[PDB]
Amino acid sequence: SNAVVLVLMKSDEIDAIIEDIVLKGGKAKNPSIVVEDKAGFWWIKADGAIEIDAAEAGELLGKPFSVYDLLINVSSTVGRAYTLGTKFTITSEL
């Protein structure tokens, strides 16, 4: 039902940034966003439109990382993920 989640493979640093970056950000237009962290798994869940990228994975291995990383981390693609050459995004309604 609309509900959509964003899932990454980071964690740790997120609960910190999700908090100072999303806690409030997901508190304005966002009704209430959850923040999951699994030692190398940044799983966040929102009820609108969440953003996500893969460039970082490139600075890490610097190869298909853009996607090989989005594919392994976007596993929670639920509402698919519109890509943007360098960054993609997962949402629900059009």
The beta-strand segments (E) located in 1-94 are 4-7, 34-37, 42-46, 49-53, 81-84, 87-91
- Helix, strand, coil percentages (3-state) for the chain, rounded to 5, are 35, 30, 35
Give me the sheet containing 49-53, strands edge to edge: 49-53, 87-91, 81-84
Distance, in Å, from the CA atom of 12 to the CA atom of 70, rounded to the nearest integer, reads 18
- The CATH H-level superfamily of 1-94 is Monooxygenase component MmoB/DmpM (3.90.56.10)
Distance, in Å, from the CA atom of 58 to the CA atom of 30, rounded to the nearest integer, reads 30
